[PDB]
Amino acid sequence: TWRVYSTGSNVFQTRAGCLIGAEHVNNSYECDIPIGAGICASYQTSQSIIAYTMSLGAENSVAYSNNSIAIPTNFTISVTTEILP
Amino acid sequence: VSMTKTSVDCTMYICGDSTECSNLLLQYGSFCTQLNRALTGIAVEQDKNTQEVFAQVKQIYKTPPIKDFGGFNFSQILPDPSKPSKRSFIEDLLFNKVTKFNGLTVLPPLLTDEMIAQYTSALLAGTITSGWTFGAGAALQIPFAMQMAYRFNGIGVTQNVLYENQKLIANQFNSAIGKIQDSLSSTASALGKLQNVVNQNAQALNTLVKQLSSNFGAISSVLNDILSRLDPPEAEVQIDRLITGRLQSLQTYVTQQLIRAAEIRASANLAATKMSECVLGQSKRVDFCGKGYHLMSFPQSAPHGVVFLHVTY
Amino acid sequence: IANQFNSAIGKIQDSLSSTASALGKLQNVVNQNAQALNTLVKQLSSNFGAISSVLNDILSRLDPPEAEVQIDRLITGRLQSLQTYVTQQLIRAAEIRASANLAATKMSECVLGQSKRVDFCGKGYHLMSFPQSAPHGVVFLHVTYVPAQEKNFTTAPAICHDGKAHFPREGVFVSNGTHWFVTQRNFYEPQIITTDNTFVSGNCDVVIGIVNNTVYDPLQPELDS
Predict the structure, then answer these.
(1) In whole angstroms, what is the distance from residue B118 CA to residue C113 CA?
(2) C207/B28 Cβ within 8 A
(3) Which among A67, A77, A78 is the nearest to C1, CB-wise?
(4) Which residue among A77, B6, B46, C20 has the highest number of C-beta atoms inside a 10 angstrom radius?
(5) Which residues in chain B have their CB less than 8 angstroms from residue C120's CB?
(6) How far apart are CA B110 and CA B114, in angstroms?
(7) Which distant-in-sequence residues (6+ apart) come within 8 Å of A60 by Cβ?
(8) Cβ neighbours of residue B108 under 8 Å, at least 6 residues apart?
(9) Sheet containing A48-53, strands listed edge to edge, beginning at the edge strand earlier in sequence
(10) Is C199:C169 a contact under the CB 8 Å cutoff?
């Protein structure tokens, strides 16, 4: 019955269908609401719903040589949790 | 690892564009609330099996531009930057061997195959440049000639065997990697485990369409043929024989797919254990990361699964 | 170490009191069993093609030659509701069986001993574990060992002293720019290269990347007796 979203300037054609009601951004963050085919959605910045590509993590290339080594000097003691029914 | 996500509709499958059929379906209670809740939880679980296997680390590591690994050639498993699809030579051979309107929909997966190949290339750059340190803290730079001096000590071999025979081990490693490229280009029956997942999901959907042409004791199978011949005190009886005959066809498809989802769940928990014990370290368990004394492993991508390359002694 | 362990237990009390979705694996079992029993009750009010859903209504308005047809539509519709509820509960009982066998394996390996399996009893090098009780489940507390600060050095596979190659027994060779020392792989402790930390085998011709240094002999102050 409802046809109030077909005004325009909000379509974003994806591989699962066009997302009517969210604008497209060029950034890439760790998404929480999965949509499909790499596209995600979130409610962040006057707030709106954004749509972007899901990022896979930070970029960190390590150094590498034929005569280089890395030896640790300190340590932290960490206590984690795990829940199993 | 995973299966094919799907979803069925109750309105268009049982009632072929008929408002008289939908009035009789409301008297059967909430049968289709349970049928849509069951197939939704399967498609959510198929996206969770790819998260526990591939997303073991979250920092993306890169290969240095100069190749100096003590004589070892990793040009068959590293991705090709010239191709638009970031895949290796072995991943291009694995992706070439594995090969409507009644409410049947195929939902696309969340993680794209390009994004899966970046998870595999990030772990290949971790076991080479760091080895076992990037899975238990921060990445520490260790040379590749010094990594096998520790891995030989874990199986009871001293460091004099590796350093005095560096040319013999490097020649046997490059000849064994290239032998899989000559094997996967000839025989196609090695990927029979991944082909049975697609064939079982195709026969389960072809049977669901062919059961719409059955009469189930009625006059005809078309719902438009009964409404245009019979009076509605009599047409309700022939329609009710088709609703019960088609409701049992849908409950068999959901029940048979809930056991296949539990079989593919046990194979995803086994693959997630081998990505942490055989790839991120050296395992002492016999016949877990290959036959013999395990040294290291390399993960590879595959359609609806994983492919391991264990290196033994 | 004792100050870092006592501060880690206090962070769990602040995390469990503030966050309300820390036990989502245990509340999903209770919510799934609640929706399965609510569906079995609400399907008693359906007709399944009969006159009424109440069995006391069709038994009083019609004859037993006539009421046998309306009762048959209510029995067959309600028998498929019990066959569906048992079948879905028999699959969920198999999923909770695999979670119970996994918790019994971690009770013996992570708690009753020390496991060398990577990413099984926590992230990092596992030291010990402590179990805790929970409604319809268990809660583990994995104590691990994570290195923090790093430093770059210069390494070498072996050293040649007087025509013989010297390989280390434990650890790797490092260098601060001028001298050479022997340290472990997980912690930095510089030691003097003596004959008790080396392993003589062969010459320094076939080792690729060897350097030249001296190995101290502890029998040199012995001659001053």
Answers:
(1) 37
(2) no
(3) A77
(4) B46
(5) 273, 276-277
(6) 11
(7) B59, B60, B61, B139
(8) A15, A16, A36, A37, B5
(9) A23-24, A48-53, A39-44, A33-36
(10) yes
